[PDB]
Ligand SMILES: N[C@@H](Cc1ccc(O)cc1)C(=O)N[C@H](C(=O)O)[C@H]1[C@H](O)[C@]2(O)CO[C@@H]([C@@H]2O)N1O
């Protein structure tokens with residue numbers, strides 16, 4: 001037992017683990033409960049997010065359980081991570097509308113409603129409780145200011161000027177990890193490299209809150225093209241996984257025009273085919289490019305999956 | 320939590336539970352590990368078996384784990400259950416060939432090769448160890464002769480004359496239950512009504528072997544048509560799930576010619592559609608029979624699934 005880790009590794013979906021070995025350990029020992037999430041900073045997800053929720057779906061394959069945290073509370077605050085300009089609070093309505101779009105999608109990428117598997121939690125439910133006073137006492141007490149300015153996210157912002165709220169974002173997100181880690185048994189939290197800071201902070205908090213009751217954080221790498229261009233972007237902004245923001249057709253082509261070079265990779269990252277199916281699918285590319293089979297079965301997969309069998313046919317027929 | 324049981328019940332797939340309530344209990348409490356199996360008394364499964372392996376697949380839906388016991392050891396002996404004429408030992412080669420066919424199929428109905436989910440065990444592995452002496456001592460000691468003549472299977476045979484071997488079949492099968500119940504954690508064993516006897520005996524043995532370390536047996540009902548005819552049979556014997564014994568086409572039609580009456584039922588039993596999808600699919604039948612939509616989406620499902628998307632198209636095109 002170590003196949004799952006064997007492939008994540010093969011495909012190149014592991015940019016960093018907190019405890020490389022220990023992760024390997026429980027993953028070959030007990031059926032883990034891992035989660036991931038997004039703040040509804042919009043009403044549609046987008047190729048950018050498609051990667052790690054897939055990685056979550058690749059776990060569920062082998063027996064594990066994923067959980068999906070929509071940004072019900074941290075949404076309204078905004079994660080300064082990466083950013084280099086303070087955020088802009090959305091309106092309660094907007095967020096309440098945004099999470100209807102963002103969730104509307106997950107509910108298709110995942111099968112919610114089972115007796116034991118995949119839960120869609122809304123951190124609005126617990127973060128909505130904790131008060132000003134409590135917060136400081138119970139959690140604040142154990143969050144050193146010297147660790148926070150440590151965060152590679154904020155370090156930056158600190159320079160331009162970081163508001164308090166972006167600054168206390170990390171404590172809210174850390175609170176979540178522990179809460180699931182306690183409430184549902186979350187031991188691994190998977191997220192993008194833009195999430196290292198936060199991932200690592202959630203695990204430290206519970207270390208002095210109870211002595212990290214067995215938590216680990218994994219990070220999927222970052223999608224990178226060969227044309228040197230901000231993957232995910234189009235004059236049509238970024239490829240939204242919503243049919244009326246980015247349609248099966250526009251979707252389709254995106255994948256169909258995948259610069260031959262950065263192809264097999266994207267096959268590995270985004271498609272549920274084997275190393276053998278891909279391997280074959282690599283020859284077909286290495287010496288019969290006219291047929292453009294790789295770049296074709298890619299798009300086929302991602303479009304049928306994300307959009308539909310029907311919306312694949314409906315799409316393919318526009319060349 | 321109680322949806323899975325909620326539907327099994329809805330569809331009518333529960334002919335009997337050993338401990339009705341307790342089953343409900345652990346199924347709403349912990350992720351169970353249930354199994355089922357067949358002796359390779361042939362080289363192809365058949366509609367008859369398609370039902371309970373589906374039921375096993377309906378568990379895996381909600382989080383549970385199935386296991387598949389091919390008849391590697393009990394195969395060679397034959398389960399007199401139901402039968403009313405002693406068996407006929409197969410040849411080691413035959414069984415060794417038969418289990419290549421029988422397994423060749425499961426490996427498509429189930430996804431083996433994961434880190435935590437679905438295992439294909441071969442009881443040849445443990446039953447091949449136990450000797451004449453051991454057997455009597457360790458297990459035989461705790462199997463009363465008065466319980467065995469109790470078995471509704473043999474009771475019958477007893478009348479025509481039941482050889483010792485058919486008679487000791489039940490002890491071999493009971494041995495299995497406990498072994499998984501101990502080896503892998505098997506708590507529920509699902510099987511046809513022709514398997515009550517055996518199901519119930521496996522649980523009794525471990526009751527005096529250690530005090531039934533938490534075991535239960537469930538039984539799927541029996542497929543029954545409205546035309547009053549031995550479901551599963553055709554002049555082409557019985558509908559073998561093998562393409563070269565019973566092909567996508569011959570397969571297809573079978574389902575397509577499903578006597579309108581015993582339809583929705585078969586939709587429930589054999590298809591992964593909702594109560595809503597079916598409900599709609601029941602109207603379409605109740606008042607627009609010309610279209611024959613029910614009997615059509617049925618066959619469609621079962622054929623694509625069992626045989627292939629491709630072998631569905633390939634099939635549908637023969638009307
Ligand atoms: N502050 C986090 C959100 C969060 C909210 C609650 C938690 O309990 C833990 C984390 C973040 O940055 N997430 C992104 C988002 O949209 O909210 C998404 C990004 O958009 C992704 O592309 C999708 O998943 C990763 C990856 O960076 N990430 O979580």
Ligand SMILES: N[C@@H](Cc1ccc(O)cc1)C(=O)N[C@H](C(=O)O)[C@H]1[C@H](O)[C@]2(O)CO[C@@H]([C@@H]2O)N1O
Pocket residue numbers: 355356357358359360367368369371388389390393398400442492495496510511512513514517
């Ligand atoms: N003695 C059992 C086999 C067995 C072998 C090992 C075990 O550990 C427990 C049971 C039996 O009768 N099984 C059938 C078979 O072909 O072997 C199958 C039947 O053929 C089915 O149609 C398929 O599953 C059920 C149902 O009656 N059943 O187990």
